[PDB]
RNA sequence: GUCAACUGUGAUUGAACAAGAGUUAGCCGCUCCUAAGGGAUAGCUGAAAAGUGUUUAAAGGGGUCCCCGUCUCAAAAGGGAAACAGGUUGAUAUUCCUGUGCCAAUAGUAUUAUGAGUUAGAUGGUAACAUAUAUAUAAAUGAACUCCUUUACAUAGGCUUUACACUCGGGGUGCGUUUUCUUUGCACUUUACCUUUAUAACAAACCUUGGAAUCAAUUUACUUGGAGAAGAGGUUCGUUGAACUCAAUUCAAAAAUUUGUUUUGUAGCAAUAGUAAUUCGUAAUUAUCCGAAGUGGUAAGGACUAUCCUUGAAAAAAGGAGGGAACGGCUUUGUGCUUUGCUACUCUUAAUACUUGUAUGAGCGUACCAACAACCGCAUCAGGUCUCCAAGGUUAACAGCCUCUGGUUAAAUAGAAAAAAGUAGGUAAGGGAAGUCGGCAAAAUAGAUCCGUAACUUCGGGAAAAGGAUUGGCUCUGAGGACAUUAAUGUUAACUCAGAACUGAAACGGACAAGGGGAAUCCGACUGUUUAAUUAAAACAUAGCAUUGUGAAAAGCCACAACUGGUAUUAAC
């Protein structure tokens, strides 16, 4: 059944710390453990193993990425800009 | 019951000194220090253990019969079968593709 | 220590120079049975003889110069 | 300890040897004497 | 008094860098004929973590240019690059992400990292996570090039200095807040002994210029001169201005 | 041994005799795992003996 | 031996005194390797003393003129060649003795024997891969040069497998209670390293076939699949270390050497060795040593899952591969090479003989205490001092209480008396904080199950809130599995739950164990930390906020006499 009205992933922290602080953490953590789609195979298995390093379980292959995502928007814009030329 | 005690002149419970209780035909419960468990040997490309090859430590790998160390097949106990298969294909395919490309180019 | 099964291999060891001693032992279990141990410098080889008649003939058959031990 | 280095062992023996009391016939022709418990060797 | 807390930090005793698990320095492939006159293609074999910085390091293999066989270097990884990618270095290398090119051959408005502040120095500006520089111009007679470092200064470098196409990896690292003290402990544990900080005003006088008093008041101006001597440099060093920002 | 034979005959498991929380008395996780194994075991026999269809087996 | 002094009483005792005696290793360590680091070499400074450690090195080795390349110390708990069992002394033992092994060396030359290959490099297997069983699995061409791997690694959580430990039942031995009851209570019923241990078993991985949606397989947990799943047949590693008819054997059915049935052996080591018994001499014999199972306390492993603005040493050493340098023996003209004549040759273990300095195992540690008297604390000081081993009952329990193994029954004294006072404790009629700066002290509570649970709240909590009820002993009832027979019929295991009687001085978490709670204010957000021997807090720290300097070796910030450094294995997140 539905454990929390709000908190979800950040429930582990409990009654401690600010709600606003906790909310900011919640967004980044939801992003953090999210499974990305691996463009070296077509499975949704890409996970973060260490700060900037993203491994696909199926491909056993390391994509270099952002701190909290496979792709940061800055990189995506840069990549597109290069592609256009 | 009975108790045990170290016999080997270093009594701390360090990773290489782990110890297994064993009973004697003297009816004495004694202690033996069991050798360290050793890593499997791994393929150069994919870091994954290779069939046939025993997992012996640098002392034991030296004493065993030679057949235990390696595989009668290409890059033997140094590259696994799956990687070799893919590599053999690459070695043919790119060479043909390159020759075709040169013929096309002129 | 090693366990032999082939009567012929046992004989083959028996003829050889460094096979110094034959150690023979006979015992009850429930009926009598025989353990034949051979002492080479490298190893002590044992053959289990389940029949007296075979054992008696082989113990006689051996070269007699080779050293003989009984435990009792 | 159980273990010692050879110089140290030899020295411990030397001190032990040094303790040995004055020979009884000599007195018929002491002031300085190690005792183990309350008077450590220190070296 | 005695030597102040700031001064002690410098002096080469216990405050030396936390070496032990570091994987070796990140500095680009050194300059040679083969790069200068063309291109050399290498293989990224692995991406590996580093206890010092947010960016991951990239394990790059080249085949040697005057001896048989393969030699391994450590490059700092651009975002969006990957294991098994071919990485190309040199004057004729194509503009594509994670290649290493002379800045003179960039088209304008490209985003780059791994600038050499002066040529052949193996990369020394733009290395921390999520940074980039932007190329802003080429002089009419060539030879120099104009770039923008991420602080906000503009700088002019020689054209034949290296850089790497694409943003530095591990972007956004300080977006995530550090929730609890232990996380901060672990952050500094792999860097340098510099933490917890200790407010200077709470110290005894003998240890620091802000010390003493009965309300922990600073008690004299918090801005000290550029010209100030060694033990005196206290709060806001040589500041142009104080109070909240506008632009 | 006499006391234990009596315990087998169910004689000292009353509420006052217990001296620990229910999970500590017997572990809930282990009890579940036991039960899951019993249900899986039955199902594997039923599929192996071919007395159910695969589709029905999977839903169960 | 012993009692001069000491052993705070006594003392024939003793860690005291005296006289002798005792420590045995190729395998256990050190010894070797590198780490945090140390000391030096090159420079350079400095009057020198020293400070620095490649900063203007003609510097340590490997191949056979080329290629590598600071030296050295730093682990008795990291890495690490190889050893176990029984016995034995007044005092040592993985060290002596007996047995069994293992590891490392093991030069040259000539013989011999062992098997290979040849008329300069074996085979099998569709594959994954397998293959030398010779007293001995020895031997399956390979240089330069390369490329790997093992060495070699965090934390958390569960799951599972084996081992040991513990327990139960049965047979056999001895002992015990034995008025009454007691097919009884207790003890003993042993098995090492070593044999690539032989095989089996099992978690994985991988292969051949196969071609999958009404998706499937599937674990406690989720994992996995057209980049090939299920199914079926295999190959391997790792656990394990005689499992399994395993091996040997027998007879029945086979092939110019298999399957079925029987007999053996604690699989060899292994009973000759242990242990419990039983007799006779006063050393010798005999008899025993094994059929089922459960609990899960320890430890290891396996397969895993999760956690990280933290990702968790290095080398010595060893191994594998790529590569394709080099290549019959004998006789002989001519200058290692060329052409003629001839065919058992090249490997490879082990043994042997002879020469070569004497041709097998270096040196060092090993007593005892490890605190209760052997240490430190001025001492036989209720202090302090690192690690492993972990029995029964009660129990959540390695808690507390009592018990077995083992240890002790001694503490810087004893007896007798019994008062004040002291101190460590109990307990109190009726009242219930009136005492006191102050409910300090003391008491009350407490275990569990079942109910019930507010203000307020950052919605997570508050919360065991508050507040109730129940709880013994006996005698029953119901609930929950595993197997195997051809739905029913059988064999068979635990402990936990739930319900009902009867019973008693209404008592039953009976001992031990074990929350006082509530209503509010002030300060500090929190967990954290601190004045060692007067202050633990409201002090300090902390995350977040905010500010400042600095684009780099002609910079920031900082150390140093100087040269030179540190931050920096760095670079505005």
PDB file of C-alpha atoms in Angstrom, chain E:
ATOM      1  CA  UNK E   1      51.248  35.149  19.626  1.00  0.00           C
ATOM      2  CA  UNK E   2      52.153  31.907  17.917  1.00  0.00           C
ATOM      3  CA  UNK E   3      51.850  30.775  14.298  1.00  0.00           C
ATOM      4  CA  UNK E   4      48.257  31.291  13.109  1.00  0.00           C
ATOM      5  CA  UNK E   5      46.028  28.507  11.738  1.00  0.00           C
ATOM      6  CA  UNK E   6      46.280  29.714   8.131  1.00  0.00           C
ATOM      7  CA  UNK E   7      50.074  29.787   8.237  1.00  0.00           C
ATOM      8  CA  UNK E   8      50.361  26.287   9.654  1.00  0.00           C
ATOM      9  CA  UNK E   9      48.372  24.873   6.723  1.00  0.00           C
ATOM     10  CA  UNK E  10      51.114  25.702   4.214  1.00  0.00           C
ATOM     11  CA  UNK E  11      54.154  24.393   5.906  1.00  0.00           C
ATOM     12  CA  UNK E  12      54.564  20.907   4.403  1.00  0.00           C
ATOM     13  CA  UNK E  13      53.978  18.803   7.507  1.00  0.00           C
ATOM     14  CA  UNK E  14      50.727  16.890   7.932  1.00  0.00           C
ATOM     15  CA  UNK E  15      48.798  19.015   5.460  1.00  0.00           C
ATOM     16  CA  UNK E  16      50.406  17.377   2.393  1.00  0.00           C
ATOM     17  CA  UNK E  17      48.023  16.010  -0.251  1.00  0.00           C
ATOM     18  CA  UNK E  18      46.154  12.765   0.373  1.00  0.00           C
ATOM     19  CA  UNK E  19      48.191  10.781  -2.132  1.00  0.00           C
ATOM     20  CA  UNK E  20      47.564   7.235  -1.429  1.00  0.00           C
ATOM     21  CA  UNK E  21      44.792   6.025  -3.709  1.00  0.00           C
ATOM     22  CA  UNK E  22      45.332   8.591  -6.496  1.00  0.00           C
ATOM     23  CA  UNK E  23      45.807   6.953  -9.888  1.00  0.00           C
ATOM     24  CA  UNK E  24      48.530   9.274 -11.201  1.00  0.00           C
ATOM     25  CA  UNK E  25      48.456  12.679 -12.867  1.00  0.00           C
ATOM     26  CA  UNK E  26      46.163  13.693 -15.717  1.00  0.00           C
ATOM     27  CA  UNK E  27      48.181  15.381 -18.430  1.00  0.00           C
ATOM     28  CA  UNK E  28      47.683  15.111 -22.223  1.00  0.00           C
ATOM     29  CA  UNK E  29      49.843  13.207 -24.764  1.00  0.00           C
ATOM     30  CA  UNK E  30      53.113  15.179 -25.122  1.00  0.00           C
ATOM     31  CA  UNK E  31      53.826  17.056 -28.375  1.00  0.00           C
ATOM     32  CA  UNK E  32      55.685  15.292 -31.240  1.00  0.00           C
ATOM     33  CA  UNK E  33      56.062  15.202 -35.050  1.00  0.00           C
ATOM     34  CA  UNK E  34      53.222  12.734 -35.579  1.00  0.00           C
ATOM     35  CA  UNK E  35      50.672  14.931 -33.866  1.00  0.00           C
ATOM     36  CA  UNK E  36      52.072  18.193 -35.275  1.00  0.00           C
ATOM     37  CA  UNK E  37      52.004  17.063 -38.899  1.00  0.00           C
ATOM     38  CA  UNK E  38      48.767  15.075 -38.790  1.00  0.00           C
ATOM     39  CA  UNK E  39      46.595  12.889 -36.608  1.00  0.00           C
ATOM     40  CA  UNK E  40      47.046   9.831 -34.415  1.00  0.00           C
ATOM     41  CA  UNK E  41      44.096   7.633 -33.463  1.00  0.00           C
ATOM     42  CA  UNK E  42      44.002   5.897 -30.054  1.00  0.00           C
ATOM     43  CA  UNK E  43      41.606   3.639 -28.158  1.00  0.00           C
ATOM     44  CA  UNK E  44      39.782   4.507 -24.943  1.00  0.00           C
ATOM     45  CA  UNK E  45      40.012   1.184 -23.077  1.00  0.00           C
ATOM     46  CA  UNK E  46      38.538   2.208 -19.762  1.00  0.00           C
ATOM     47  CA  UNK E  47      37.014   4.980 -17.674  1.00  0.00           C
ATOM     48  CA  UNK E  48      38.196   4.994 -14.071  1.00  0.00           C
ATOM     49  CA  UNK E  49      37.406   6.957 -10.968  1.00  0.00           C
ATOM     50  CA  UNK E  50      39.667   9.283  -9.052  1.00  0.00           C
ATOM     51  CA  UNK E  51      39.515  10.113  -5.330  1.00  0.00           C
ATOM     52  CA  UNK E  52      40.394  13.790  -5.944  1.00  0.00           C
ATOM     53  CA  UNK E  53      38.005  15.268  -8.476  1.00  0.00           C
ATOM     54  CA  UNK E  54      34.492  14.854  -9.838  1.00  0.00           C
ATOM     55  CA  UNK E  55      35.559  14.209 -13.389  1.00  0.00           C
ATOM     56  CA  UNK E  56      36.391  10.594 -14.203  1.00  0.00           C
ATOM     57  CA  UNK E  57      39.719   9.754 -15.816  1.00  0.00           C
ATOM     58  CA  UNK E  58      39.985   8.084 -19.217  1.00  0.00           C
ATOM     59  CA  UNK E  59      42.477   5.327 -19.907  1.00  0.00           C
ATOM     60  CA  UNK E  60      43.829   5.906 -23.395  1.00  0.00           C
ATOM     61  CA  UNK E  61      46.056   3.593 -25.390  1.00  0.00           C
ATOM     62  CA  UNK E  62      48.284   4.691 -28.239  1.00  0.00           C
ATOM     63  CA  UNK E  63      50.673   2.631 -30.307  1.00  0.00           C
ATOM     64  CA  UNK E  64      54.195   4.071 -30.011  1.00  0.00           C
ATOM     65  CA  UNK E  65      55.663   6.140 -32.900  1.00  0.00           C
ATOM     66  CA  UNK E  66      59.215   4.798 -32.837  1.00  0.00           C
ATOM     67  CA  UNK E  67      59.037   1.490 -30.992  1.00  0.00           C
ATOM     68  CA  UNK E  68      56.801  -1.569 -31.270  1.00  0.00           C
ATOM     69  CA  UNK E  69      53.623  -1.916 -29.210  1.00  0.00           C
ATOM     70  CA  UNK E  70      51.107  -0.097 -27.093  1.00  0.00           C
ATOM     71  CA  UNK E  71      51.672   2.631 -24.464  1.00  0.00           C
ATOM     72  CA  UNK E  72      49.026   3.925 -21.983  1.00  0.00           C
ATOM     73  CA  UNK E  73      48.273   7.569 -21.014  1.00  0.00           C
ATOM     74  CA  UNK E  74      45.643   9.143 -18.686  1.00  0.00           C
ATOM     75  CA  UNK E  75      43.413  11.820 -20.216  1.00  0.00           C
ATOM     76  CA  UNK E  76      40.647  13.699 -18.350  1.00  0.00           C
ATOM     77  CA  UNK E  77      37.255  12.660 -19.783  1.00  0.00           C
ATOM     78  CA  UNK E  78      34.873  14.882 -21.763  1.00  0.00           C
ATOM     79  CA  UNK E  79      31.165  14.284 -21.184  1.00  0.00           C
ATOM     80  CA  UNK E  80      29.451  11.898 -23.625  1.00  0.00           C
ATOM     81  CA  UNK E  81      32.571   9.841 -24.465  1.00  0.00           C
ATOM     82  CA  UNK E  82      32.736   6.079 -24.020  1.00  0.00           C
ATOM     83  CA  UNK E  83      34.710   2.849 -23.644  1.00  0.00           C
ATOM     84  CA  UNK E  84      35.715   1.535 -27.068  1.00  0.00           C
ATOM     85  CA  UNK E  85      35.570   4.958 -28.659  1.00  0.00           C
ATOM     86  CA  UNK E  86      38.413   5.913 -30.946  1.00  0.00           C
ATOM     87  CA  UNK E  87      40.035   9.130 -29.811  1.00  0.00           C
ATOM     88  CA  UNK E  88      42.023  11.199 -32.300  1.00  0.00           C
ATOM     89  CA  UNK E  89      44.777  13.718 -31.598  1.00  0.00           C
ATOM     90  CA  UNK E  90      46.445  16.263 -33.898  1.00  0.00           C
ATOM     91  CA  UNK E  91      46.527  19.162 -36.358  1.00  0.00           C
ATOM     92  CA  UNK E  92      44.418  17.347 -38.916  1.00  0.00           C
ATOM     93  CA  UNK E  93      42.054  15.677 -36.411  1.00  0.00           C
ATOM     94  CA  UNK E  94      38.345  16.298 -37.210  1.00  0.00           C
ATOM     95  CA  UNK E  95      36.157  18.504 -35.012  1.00  0.00           C
ATOM     96  CA  UNK E  96      34.309  15.810 -33.040  1.00  0.00           C
ATOM     97  CA  UNK E  97      33.649  15.259 -29.352  1.00  0.00           C
ATOM     98  CA  UNK E  98      36.624  14.182 -27.231  1.00  0.00           C
ATOM     99  CA  UNK E  99      39.205  14.646 -29.961  1.00  0.00           C
ATOM    100  CA  UNK E 100      42.328  16.702 -29.214  1.00  0.00           C
ATOM    101  CA  UNK E 101      42.933  19.573 -31.639  1.00  0.00           C
ATOM    102  CA  UNK E 102      44.979  22.782 -31.822  1.00  0.00           C
ATOM    103  CA  UNK E 103      42.759  25.777 -30.889  1.00  0.00           C
ATOM    104  CA  UNK E 104      43.758  27.491 -34.154  1.00  0.00           C
ATOM    105  CA  UNK E 105      41.673  24.950 -36.053  1.00  0.00           C
ATOM    106  CA  UNK E 106      38.439  25.425 -34.104  1.00  0.00           C
ATOM    107  CA  UNK E 107      35.435  27.094 -35.738  1.00  0.00           C
ATOM    108  CA  UNK E 108      34.180  29.952 -33.545  1.00  0.00           C
ATOM    109  CA  UNK E 109      31.708  29.369 -30.693  1.00  0.00           C
ATOM    110  CA  UNK E 110      32.788  25.776 -30.118  1.00  0.00           C
ATOM    111  CA  UNK E 111      32.877  24.544 -26.514  1.00  0.00           C
ATOM    112  CA  UNK E 112      36.205  23.077 -25.375  1.00  0.00           C
ATOM    113  CA  UNK E 113      38.241  21.990 -22.375  1.00  0.00           C
ATOM    114  CA  UNK E 114      41.861  21.015 -21.598  1.00  0.00           C
ATOM    115  CA  UNK E 115      43.435  24.320 -22.647  1.00  0.00           C
ATOM    116  CA  UNK E 116      47.195  24.552 -22.434  1.00  0.00           C
ATOM    117  CA  UNK E 117      47.931  27.991 -20.948  1.00  0.00           C
ATOM    118  CA  UNK E 118      51.037  28.110 -23.109  1.00  0.00           C
ATOM    119  CA  UNK E 119      51.797  25.498 -25.816  1.00  0.00           C
ATOM    120  CA  UNK E 120      52.879  21.886 -25.270  1.00  0.00           C
ATOM    121  CA  UNK E 121      52.178  21.958 -21.571  1.00  0.00           C
ATOM    122  CA  UNK E 122      49.876  18.941 -21.643  1.00  0.00           C
ATOM    123  CA  UNK E 123      46.694  20.750 -20.424  1.00  0.00           C
ATOM    124  CA  UNK E 124      46.411  23.066 -17.452  1.00  0.00           C
ATOM    125  CA  UNK E 125      43.239  25.191 -17.681  1.00  0.00           C
ATOM    126  CA  UNK E 126      39.658  23.834 -17.523  1.00  0.00           C
ATOM    127  CA  UNK E 127      39.911  20.456 -15.769  1.00  0.00           C
ATOM    128  CA  UNK E 128      37.401  20.563 -12.893  1.00  0.00           C
ATOM    129  CA  UNK E 129      34.000  18.890 -13.380  1.00  0.00           C
ATOM    130  CA  UNK E 130      31.331  20.506 -15.540  1.00  0.00           C
ATOM    131  CA  UNK E 131      33.485  23.374 -16.733  1.00  0.00           C
ATOM    132  CA  UNK E 132      34.098  24.443 -20.274  1.00  0.00           C
ATOM    133  CA  UNK E 133      35.763  27.200 -22.194  1.00  0.00           C
ATOM    134  CA  UNK E 134      34.369  28.801 -25.355  1.00  0.00           C
ATOM    135  CA  UNK E 135      36.455  29.830 -28.327  1.00  0.00           C
ATOM    136  CA  UNK E 136      35.607  33.465 -29.151  1.00  0.00           C
ATOM    137  CA  UNK E 137      37.894  34.415 -32.060  1.00  0.00           C
ATOM    138  CA  UNK E 138      40.831  34.027 -34.425  1.00  0.00           C
ATOM    139  CA  UNK E 139      43.112  36.952 -35.300  1.00  0.00           C
ATOM    140  CA  UNK E 140      43.363  38.070 -38.955  1.00  0.00           C
ATOM    141  CA  UNK E 141      47.070  37.162 -39.226  1.00  0.00           C
ATOM    142  CA  UNK E 142      46.269  33.932 -37.318  1.00  0.00           C
ATOM    143  CA  UNK E 143      48.836  32.677 -34.825  1.00  0.00           C
ATOM    144  CA  UNK E 144      46.984  33.805 -31.674  1.00  0.00           C
ATOM    145  CA  UNK E 145      43.480  32.718 -30.563  1.00  0.00           C
ATOM    146  CA  UNK E 146      40.972  34.199 -28.100  1.00  0.00           C
ATOM    147  CA  UNK E 147      39.252  32.006 -25.493  1.00  0.00           C
ATOM    148  CA  UNK E 148      36.999  32.386 -22.466  1.00  0.00           C
ATOM    149  CA  UNK E 149      37.777  30.654 -19.147  1.00  0.00           C
ATOM    150  CA  UNK E 150      34.737  29.691 -17.058  1.00  0.00           C
ATOM    151  CA  UNK E 151      35.413  32.196 -14.265  1.00  0.00           C
ATOM    152  CA  UNK E 152      34.441  35.055 -16.594  1.00  0.00           C
ATOM    153  CA  UNK E 153      37.800  36.354 -17.768  1.00  0.00           C
ATOM    154  CA  UNK E 154      38.764  36.476 -21.448  1.00  0.00           C
ATOM    155  CA  UNK E 155      42.299  35.281 -22.320  1.00  0.00           C
ATOM    156  CA  UNK E 156      44.513  35.199 -25.445  1.00  0.00           C
ATOM    157  CA  UNK E 157      46.657  32.110 -26.126  1.00  0.00           C
ATOM    158  CA  UNK E 158      48.859  30.841 -28.980  1.00  0.00           C
ATOM    159  CA  UNK E 159      46.900  29.079 -31.772  1.00  0.00           C
ATOM    160  CA  UNK E 160      48.894  25.862 -31.689  1.00  0.00           C
ATOM    161  CA  UNK E 161      48.032  25.198 -28.047  1.00  0.00           C
ATOM    162  CA  UNK E 162      45.914  22.066 -27.509  1.00  0.00           C
ATOM    163  CA  UNK E 163      42.348  21.670 -26.359  1.00  0.00           C
ATOM    164  CA  UNK E 164      39.664  18.961 -26.299  1.00  0.00           C
ATOM    165  CA  UNK E 165      36.312  19.343 -28.032  1.00  0.00           C
ATOM    166  CA  UNK E 166      33.305  19.104 -25.635  1.00  0.00           C
ATOM    167  CA  UNK E 167      32.400  19.947 -22.024  1.00  0.00           C
ATOM    168  CA  UNK E 168      34.298  18.389 -19.055  1.00  0.00           C
ATOM    169  CA  UNK E 169      32.556  15.344 -17.507  1.00  0.00           C
ATOM    170  CA  UNK E 170      30.596  15.010 -14.273  1.00  0.00           C
ATOM    171  CA  UNK E 171      28.551  18.174 -14.787  1.00  0.00           C
ATOM    172  CA  UNK E 172      26.338  19.662 -12.087  1.00  0.00           C
ATOM    173  CA  UNK E 173      28.276  18.240  -9.137  1.00  0.00           C
ATOM    174  CA  UNK E 174      27.514  21.033  -6.650  1.00  0.00           C
ATOM    175  CA  UNK E 175      23.812  20.970  -7.508  1.00  0.00           C
ATOM    176  CA  UNK E 176      23.286  18.165  -4.930  1.00  0.00           C
ATOM    177  CA  UNK E 177      23.391  19.497  -1.338  1.00  0.00           C
ATOM    178  CA  UNK E 178      25.564  17.743   1.232  1.00  0.00           C
ATOM    179  CA  UNK E 179      22.921  16.667   3.756  1.00  0.00           C
ATOM    180  CA  UNK E 180      24.959  15.587   6.814  1.00  0.00           C
ATOM    181  CA  UNK E 181      28.358  16.175   8.407  1.00  0.00           C
ATOM    182  CA  UNK E 182      29.706  12.711   7.644  1.00  0.00           C
ATOM    183  CA  UNK E 183      29.302  13.283   3.919  1.00  0.00           C
ATOM    184  CA  UNK E 184      31.393  16.424   4.325  1.00  0.00           C
ATOM    185  CA  UNK E 185      33.882  14.393   6.374  1.00  0.00           C
ATOM    186  CA  UNK E 186      34.151  11.878   3.555  1.00  0.00           C
ATOM    187  CA  UNK E 187      34.574  14.674   0.978  1.00  0.00           C
ATOM    188  CA  UNK E 188      37.540  16.171   2.748  1.00  0.00           C
ATOM    189  CA  UNK E 189      38.945  12.740   3.778  1.00  0.00           C
ATOM    190  CA  UNK E 190      40.037  12.072   0.209  1.00  0.00           C
ATOM    191  CA  UNK E 191      41.305  15.621  -0.371  1.00  0.00           C
ATOM    192  CA  UNK E 192      43.313  17.496   2.227  1.00  0.00           C
ATOM    193  CA  UNK E 193      43.093  17.998   6.000  1.00  0.00           C
ATOM    194  CA  UNK E 194      41.339  21.384   6.019  1.00  0.00           C
ATOM    195  CA  UNK E 195      38.130  20.744   7.858  1.00  0.00           C
ATOM    196  CA  UNK E 196      36.169  21.205  10.113  1.00  0.00           C
ATOM    197  CA  UNK E 197      36.964  24.903   9.692  1.00  0.00           C
ATOM    198  CA  UNK E 198      36.829  26.575  13.152  1.00  0.00           C
ATOM    199  CA  UNK E 199      35.684  30.223  13.269  1.00  0.00           C
ATOM    200  CA  UNK E 200      38.713  32.482  13.838  1.00  0.00           C
ATOM    201  CA  UNK E 201      36.844  34.804  16.141  1.00  0.00           C
ATOM    202  CA  UNK E 202      36.242  31.988  18.588  1.00  0.00           C
ATOM    203  CA  UNK E 203      39.976  31.324  18.960  1.00  0.00           C
ATOM    204  CA  UNK E 204      42.155  32.719  21.729  1.00  0.00           C
ATOM    205  CA  UNK E 205      44.074  35.924  20.820  1.00  0.00           C
ATOM    206  CA  UNK E 206      47.399  34.062  20.787  1.00  0.00           C
ATOM    207  CA  UNK E 207      46.286  32.023  17.824  1.00  0.00           C
ATOM    208  CA  UNK E 208      44.615  34.510  15.515  1.00  0.00           C
ATOM    209  CA  UNK E 209      43.935  38.203  14.746  1.00  0.00           C
ATOM    210  CA  UNK E 210      40.194  38.026  15.241  1.00  0.00           C
ATOM    211  CA  UNK E 211      40.518  36.407  18.689  1.00  0.00           C
ATOM    212  CA  UNK E 212      39.462  37.633  22.128  1.00  0.00           C
ATOM    213  CA  UNK E 213      36.725  39.848  23.517  1.00  0.00           C
ATOM    214  CA  UNK E 214      33.502  38.882  25.253  1.00  0.00           C
ATOM    215  CA  UNK E 215      30.995  38.774  22.438  1.00  0.00           C
ATOM    216  CA  UNK E 216      33.064  37.192  19.680  1.00  0.00           C
ATOM    217  CA  UNK E 217      33.069  40.533  17.888  1.00  0.00           C
ATOM    218  CA  UNK E 218      35.500  41.196  15.088  1.00  0.00           C
ATOM    219  CA  UNK E 219      36.324  44.570  16.693  1.00  0.00           C
ATOM    220  CA  UNK E 220      38.211  46.160  13.815  1.00  0.00           C
ATOM    221  CA  UNK E 221      37.741  46.081  10.008  1.00  0.00           C
ATOM    222  CA  UNK E 222      37.405  42.748   8.227  1.00  0.00           C
ATOM    223  CA  UNK E 223      39.182  43.910   5.086  1.00  0.00           C
ATOM    224  CA  UNK E 224      42.990  43.736   5.179  1.00  0.00           C
ATOM    225  CA  UNK E 225      45.459  45.111   2.641  1.00  0.00           C
ATOM    226  CA  UNK E 226      47.100  43.254  -0.224  1.00  0.00           C
ATOM    227  CA  UNK E 227      50.322  44.593   1.232  1.00  0.00           C
ATOM    228  CA  UNK E 228      49.632  42.944   4.616  1.00  0.00           C
ATOM    229  CA  UNK E 229      52.367  40.768   6.127  1.00  0.00           C
ATOM    230  CA  UNK E 230      52.230  37.033   6.575  1.00  0.00           C
ATOM    231  CA  UNK E 231      50.488  36.505   9.904  1.00  0.00           C
ATOM    232  CA  UNK E 232      48.134  39.445   9.498  1.00  0.00           C
ATOM    233  CA  UNK E 233      46.105  38.272   6.508  1.00  0.00           C
ATOM    234  CA  UNK E 234      42.835  37.573   8.266  1.00  0.00           C
ATOM    235  CA  UNK E 235      39.297  37.918   6.819  1.00  0.00           C
ATOM    236  CA  UNK E 236      38.393  39.491   3.495  1.00  0.00           C
ATOM    237  CA  UNK E 237      41.694  39.632   1.586  1.00  0.00           C
ATOM    238  CA  UNK E 238      42.341  42.889  -0.387  1.00  0.00           C
ATOM    239  CA  UNK E 239      38.658  43.229  -1.305  1.00  0.00           C
ATOM    240  CA  UNK E 240      37.354  45.697  -3.902  1.00  0.00           C
ATOM    241  CA  UNK E 241      33.989  45.897  -2.173  1.00  0.00           C
ATOM    242  CA  UNK E 242      31.872  44.133   0.471  1.00  0.00           C
ATOM    243  CA  UNK E 243      28.068  43.476   0.822  1.00  0.00           C
ATOM    244  CA  UNK E 244      25.634  41.769  -1.613  1.00  0.00           C
ATOM    245  CA  UNK E 245      26.174  41.291  -5.368  1.00  0.00           C
ATOM    246  CA  UNK E 246      24.614  43.128  -8.371  1.00  0.00           C
ATOM    247  CA  UNK E 247      26.428  42.089 -11.653  1.00  0.00           C
TER     248      UNK E 247
END
